[PDB]
Amino acid sequence: NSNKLDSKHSGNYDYWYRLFRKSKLKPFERDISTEIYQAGNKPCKGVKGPNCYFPLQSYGFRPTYGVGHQPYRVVVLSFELLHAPATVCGPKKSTNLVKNKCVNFNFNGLTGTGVLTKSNKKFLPFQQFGRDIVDTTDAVRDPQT
Amino acid sequence: KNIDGYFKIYSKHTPIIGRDFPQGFSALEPLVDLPIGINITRFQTLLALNRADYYVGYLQPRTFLLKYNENGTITDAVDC
C-alpha cells in the first residue's frame, strides 16, 4: 500500500486507466492510445459526451479513501525458467574455510568431502579447478580468497 | 568458437622473430566467456585509419595429445 507517495492535499488525478478497449488485451501487451470508443454507428471523435467516450479514465487518489480505494503499489515479476543459458540467479551463500579438518565442501558448485589446506601450486589466473592424471578433482581455487 | 552458444575467445601475444608465422610453440589462453546464443555463419574484419596480417584458419574436431608443463603450461602438443 502506497498512501504517502500517491496522495497529497487537494487531491491528485495523475494516474490513468482504460475501461474502454475495442477488444481484450493479449498477454503482455501495451495499448497506449487515445481513441474514443465507438457507440452505435457514429464515427464520432469530435463529440465528447454521450455515445462518444474517452478511452481512459483517471485514478484520482487522495489520502482519505477506503482500503479498497487506496493507491496500492503493485510490482509483478515474470521469469523464464526454460532450457536457456542462465543469466539471473539467487544469492548463493558463502561460509568459512576451517582447514586441516574433514569438512564437506561445496566450492562454487563442486561438492565433495575431504580435508583442505594451503598449497604451493602454480595456478594460472584463468585457472579455476584442479585435477590429476586420472581426472579426479585435486585442487580448487578459493573464489573469495 | 560458439559451442552451444557460450562464445569462446582465446588470445596470446608474442613479439615474434624476424619471420612472420613461426613454428615455436605458443599456448593460447582464454579471456572471456559469455552466452551469445545467436546464429554465427559469416565473419568479417574491421580496419583502422592511417595517413602481412589477418592470418585466418579454420578448426575441425580432431584428437590431440598435449604435454602439460610442471608449472601447468603447455610445452609441446602432437596431432593424432
Binding site: 601450486k121 584463468f126 579455476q128 585435477r131 | 610453440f25 578448426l59 608443463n69
Partner: peptide, 24 residues
C-alpha cells in the same frame, strides 16, 4: 584490396580446452 596467398600453418593454434590445472 587484398591478396589470397596460401601458406602452411605448421604447428600453431593450440589453446587450453578447459581451466583445469595439470602437471607432468
Amino acid at each position: 584490396t587484398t591478396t589470397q596467398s596460401y601458406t602452411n600453418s605448421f604447428t600453431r593454434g593450440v589453446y587450453y580446452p578447459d581451466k583445469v590445472f595439470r602437471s607432468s
